[PDB]
Amino acid sequence: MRDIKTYLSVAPVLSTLWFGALAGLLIEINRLFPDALSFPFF
Amino acid sequence: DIAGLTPCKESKAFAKREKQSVKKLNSSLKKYAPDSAPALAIQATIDKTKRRFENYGKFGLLCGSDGLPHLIVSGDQRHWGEFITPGVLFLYIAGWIGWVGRSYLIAVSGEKKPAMREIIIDVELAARIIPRGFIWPVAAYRELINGDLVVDDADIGY
Amino acid sequence: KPPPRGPKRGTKVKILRRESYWYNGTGSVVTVDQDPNTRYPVVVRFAKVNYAGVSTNNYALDEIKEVA
Amino acid sequence: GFVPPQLDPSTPSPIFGGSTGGLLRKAQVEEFYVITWTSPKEQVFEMPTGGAAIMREGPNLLKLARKEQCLALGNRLRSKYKIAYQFYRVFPNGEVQYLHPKDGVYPEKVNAGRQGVGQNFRSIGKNVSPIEVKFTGKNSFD
Amino acid sequence: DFLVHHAIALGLHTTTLILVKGALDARGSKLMPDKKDFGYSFPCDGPGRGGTCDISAWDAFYLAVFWMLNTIG
Amino acid sequence: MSHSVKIYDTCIGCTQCVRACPTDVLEMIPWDGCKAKQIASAPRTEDCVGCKRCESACPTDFLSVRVYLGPETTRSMALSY
Ligand SMILES: CCCCCCCCCCCCCCCCCC(=O)OC[C@H](CO[C@@H]1O[C@H](CO[C@H]2O[C@H](CO)[C@H](O)[C@H](O)[C@H]2O)[C@H](O)[C@H](O)[C@H]1O)OC(=O)CCCCCCCCCCCCCCCCC
Numbered sequence: 001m002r003d004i005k006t007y008l009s010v011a012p013v014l015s016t017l018w019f020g021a022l023a024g025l026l027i028e029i030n031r032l033f034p035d036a037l038s039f040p041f042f
Numbered sequence: 043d044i045a046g047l048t049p050c051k052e053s054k055a056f057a058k059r060e061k062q063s064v065k066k067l068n069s070s071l072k073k074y075a076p077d078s079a080p081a082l083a084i085q086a087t088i089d090k091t092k093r094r095f096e097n098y099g100k101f102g103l104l105c106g107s108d109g110l111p112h113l114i115v116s117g118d119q120r121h122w123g124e125f126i127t128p129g130v131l132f133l134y135i136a137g138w139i140g141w142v143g144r145s146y147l148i149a150v151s152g153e154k155k156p157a158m159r160e161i162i163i164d165v166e167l168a169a170r171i172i173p174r175g176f177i178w179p180v181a182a183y184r185e186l187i188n189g190d191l192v193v194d195d196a197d198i199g200y
Numbered sequence: 201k202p203p204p205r206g207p208k209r210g211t212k213v214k215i216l217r218r219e220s221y222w223y224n225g226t227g228s229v230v231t232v233d234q235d236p237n238t239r240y241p242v243v244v245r246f247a248k249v250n251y252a253g254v255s256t257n258n259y260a261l262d263e264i265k266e267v268a
Numbered sequence: 269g270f271v272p273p274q275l276d277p278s279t280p281s282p283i284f285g286g287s288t289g290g291l292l293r294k295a296q297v298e299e300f301y302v303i304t305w306t307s308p309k310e311q312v313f314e315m316p317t318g319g320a321a322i323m324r325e326g327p328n329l330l331k332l333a334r335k336e337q338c339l340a341l342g343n344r345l346r347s348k349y350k351i352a353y354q355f356y357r358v359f360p361n362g363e364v365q366y367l368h369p370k371d372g373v374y375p376e377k378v379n380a381g382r383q384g385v386g387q388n389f390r391s392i393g394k395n396v397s398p399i400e401v402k403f404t405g406k407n408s409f410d
Numbered sequence: 411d412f413l414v415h416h417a418i419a420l421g422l423h424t425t426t427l428i429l430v431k432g433a434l435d436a437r438g439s440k441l442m443p444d445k446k447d448f449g450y451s452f453p454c455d456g457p458g459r460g461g462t463c464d465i466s467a468w469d470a471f472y473l474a475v476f477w478m479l480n481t482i483g
Numbered sequence: 484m485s486h487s488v489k490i491y492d493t494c495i496g497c498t499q500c501v502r503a504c505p506t507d508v509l510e511m512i513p514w515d516g517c518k519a520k521q522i523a524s525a526p527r528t529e530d531c532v533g534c535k536r537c538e539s540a541c542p543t544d545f546l547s548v549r550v551y552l553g554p555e556t557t558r559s560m561a562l563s564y
Pocket residue numbers: 029033034035036037038039040097100124125128416
């Protein structure tokens with residue numbers, strides 16, 4: 001079990017999941033704010 | 043009106059671009075059933091680009107002589123919703139990332155062969171080091187104050 | 201009874217030689233040959249491997265600083 | 269130096285069909301090489317320049333173009349079948365020269381009697397800059 | 411014109427980088443600290459110790475001419 | 484004399500070059516400047532082909548045997564024709 005944990009902590013899979021989460025966040029932001037060119041908050 | 047660039051809340055070529063875009067979209071729309079989900083998504087994108095044109099006509103966007111937005115990064119905070127605030131926001135993010143990475147590495151340096159933890163991250167230590175980003179401006183600050191950020195004549199080895 | 205040259209053991213050394221990969225580098229003494237016919241009697245291990253894959257070499261005492 | 273040469277004789281050749289790896293104009297005008305060894309048993313070995321052939325019993329005699337191929341084959345024969353060997357150089361005048369051992373003992377190990385041709389008693393960093401020696405014949409490593 | 415001027419500045423800075431690296435690192439870097447004894451243009455310093463293709467300063471000028479042509483184009 | 488070989492007193496007398504010399508150039512000689520009491524020597528630089536494999540082996544600080552290049556000849560070029 002702990003072996004599969006140390007394997008999961010190997011940079012490829014960690015990086016893939018991290019990048020997937022980041023891309024999901026970005027595409028969701030783009031969905032909720034289409035075309036988002038300026039900073040119309042301040 | 044910087045160098046004569048009128049905002050397309052008032053210019054015309056912007057309206058012409060908007061009109062032609064919605065026109066070609068609508069002409070494409072009338073080749074299906076008025077209820078087909080593809081036609082529905084087409085009308086959705088139509089109103090979406092329409093409200094985009096509207097939003098652009100709400101935030102002082104000085105607008106070119108050809109019907110296109112044009113940023114004004116000259117420093118005047120009047121047009122700052124393009125560079126200054128997003129610039130400092132991204133600088134905050136980048137400082138976050140740089141500081142957290144540097145701190146992780148400085149920490150994990152003290153082991154037997156740090157390469158084994160540089161290829162396979164100490165995800166526990168990584169998790170209890172990562173959220174420190176809120177300190178990256180101030181912390182590094184004190185470092186430079188105490189001179190614990192740079193080195194003088196230690197170059198190779200460590 | 202004849203005083204053996206070179207540091208004793210474990211003494212981290214700072215390299216003074218210029219034409220080595222570890223110029224201004226921090227290594228560890230592993231032994232020194234007490235023979236006065238040597239010409240490079242100290243030997244130092246490192247934690248950074250050089251281009252040739254080696255991680256150890258020889259020096260005299262003049263090219264050492266017994267840092268601590 | 270009690271390390272005399274052996275004055276390479278004319279002994280039979282290995283059994284081989286003859287092929288496009290042999291000698292050329294160079295060997296017939298400038299120089300070539302002959303490697304010679306005694307063999308323990310008729311076996312098979314790959315020649316340097318193509319294919320394989322068999323050796324005979326007793327002393328052998330193989331000819332080749334350049335010294336590198338001869339020495340490569342000799343190292344193969346020393347690491348594969350544990351036999352000693354020599355190789356000689358020939359000149360179109362008729363001269364024969366004895367090259368590799370120069371004492372009989374491999375150059376791999378120490379054997380007093382060899383001079384010190386080409387030493388510098390200083391580490392590599394001590395070499396000097398070409399400006400200090402420009403407009404002369406000397407160079408830094410000399 | 412702004413974007414093109416920025417691309418031109420890119421070309422300028424990178425070509426300068428190539429040439430200045432060729433100049434300063436000509437005496438020798440930790441890859442070959444005694445390069446200053448090999449003269450200006452030499453093939454290489456052997457395939458071992460990591461491989462040393464295209465390490466002369468002549469080779470630096472070589473690798474810079476490409477970017478020079480690019481920027482002027 | 485076509486190419487040139489040099490050897491420096493950082494030689495630890497480990498004898499890898501000679502074992503890797505392709506054309507029988509180098510050898511060892513009795514010295515007093517290491518444990519093995521033996522240092523390199525190049526009395527056969529004529530047949531020095533020029534491949535760096537010799538100094539691609541010397542596991543010293545930077546190097547201890549250098550192969551400086553020079554003019555060319557018929558044998559220093561691996562010519563066989
Ligand atoms: C050449 C070399 C020189 C150097 C290089 C220079 C090259 C030029 C570089 C220029 C770069 C410019 C980039 C600008 C991007 C701005 C992004 C942005 O402003 O984004 C803002 C947009 C806003 O979208 C728009 O937001 C608008 C806001 O409307 C507002 O305005 C209305 C007006 O009627 C109302 O009055 C009301 O105020 C309000 O509804 C409309 O809703 C539009 O429909 C909608 O599209 O998205 C959002 O709001 C996202 C949610 C908020 C995120 C930020 C707050 C949270 C803090 C960070 C938390 C982590 C999240 C990180 C996210 C990072 C990415 C954002």
